[PDB]
Structures are given as structure tokens and as C-alpha cells.
Amino acid sequence: EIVLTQSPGTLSLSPGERASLSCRASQSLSTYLAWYQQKPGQAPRLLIFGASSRASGIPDRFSGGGSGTDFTLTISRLEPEDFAVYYCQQYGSSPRTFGQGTKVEIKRTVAAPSVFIFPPSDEQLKSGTASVVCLLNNFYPREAKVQWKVDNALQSGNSQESVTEQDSKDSTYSLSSTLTLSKADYEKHKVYACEVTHQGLSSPVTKSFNRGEC
């Protein structure tokens, strides 16, 4: 399997006239690469074949370029519909391989996140599993750091992070982080806190609650 990577993991740009995508391949492909646009919730659609010739049914704005190791996909004019995950697949040498893919984000004014912390419900405590949910609202860029601190001690590997897709109205991302603890473990620690670090935030914001609404 030929090793291929996309140089921009994620690109954020406004819906204007500027777009660029780069794929680098360890072994020369001799101008044998293709690009696919996958809309979220939809099957992938071929954009270009061979990186030189536009596929049928593809708008003129879409363009492809590059040879051998370096392949570049540039969109002359960008529209909201165009934004989607983009995958480049190498077929020159068997086995055929697919790139990890690049999502084109929509550029928006940087916004500090809104942090909400919810203590576990009494019914959940009756169940015996305690979950603390940290909610982030309307934060751009999508990338964010959430750290759980219990008794001023960081917790790693006990949290699951869920991110919604970019909201259409304001181009913003919302993230929920869940910390799962056993009832005995939850009882042991009096204070639960979550530290969030974001570009918008001047300084990291920590939101905390005391056990049993202490």
C-alpha cells in the first residue's frame, strides 16, 4: 500500500474564491491520482481523474494539478455547497489506497466558548454510574482542549469527546465531553472541575461544581 498523506489536515476559509488541497505520496504515481468529494451523510463523488482532466458533471471552477509525488487541488471559485471532506486515492500501484481526507471549514470570527457543567442526575446515581457532562457552545475554531480536574488533579483517558457538525446559521461548533465515574469513585471526590483552553479565551476557563451541590 503506497503511503499517501494530505498536507492540510483541516483548512478553514471563507466562502469566496480561494481554495487549495495538497497530497504527498511516498512513491511516484506518474500522474495517476483521483480526488473525491464526500458530503457529510452522502456517498463520495468523483471530482477529477488523473489529476489533470475534470470529471463529467463537475463544475468548471473545480481544478486539478500536479504530477508524481506532488498533487495539488485548487478551487478557483468557492461556494457553500462545495465545502465537504475531500479524499485523494492512489491507483497507480496496487493495492489502491485512500488518503485520510481534508475537511474545508468556513472561516468565521473567532469566538470564546460557552461552558456548561451538569452534575449527574439522581436517577443515574441510583443506577450506580455517575456521569459529568461538559458542554461547549458556539466555539470557533473547532479545535479545543478540555481537561477534567478532580481535587485539582488532571484526568486523562476517562473522557469521551463529541463534536456536532458546523452549524449552518452561524458556522459554529459545539462540543460535549463526558466523564464517567462509578458511584463509589464519585463519592470519594468532593469537587469536580473542567478546564477548557481555546483561542478565543484570553485565559483558560475552568468551570467547577461541588458534589451534591455543596
Binding site: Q27, S28, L29, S30, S56, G68, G92, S93
Partner: protein
């Protein structure tokens, strides 16, 4: 040995002798460059 150049039919619709969608020329040009990788590079083969 097959040397037929008849347009391949990949669709229910009659090919019509025109290489439209679902009709493709069977022979595909083979591209060779010096810069191309060794695997892509042309090898002359003779079998006795």
C-alpha cells in the same frame, strides 16, 4: 490475440459505435516518461 477496436458496451443502451457514457474505447494509451517510477517504467518482454 485480439485486435478488435469495436467500442466496448458497458450499458443496456446500444453502443451505436460512439464512445459515449457506458461506451469506452477498449485500447487505452500507455504513458511513458523518463522521470516516471521504475514500476511505471517500460520493460521490453520477449517470451520463448
Amino acid at each position: 490475440r485480439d485486435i478488435s477496436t469495436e467500442i466496448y458496451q458497458a450499458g443496456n443502451k446500444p453502443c451505436n459505435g460512439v464512445a459515449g457514457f457506458n461506451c469506452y474505447f477498449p485500447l487505452r494509451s500507455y504513458s511513458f516518461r523518463p522521470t516516471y517510477g521504475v514500476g511505471h517504467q517500460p520493460y521490453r518482454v520477449v517470451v520463448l
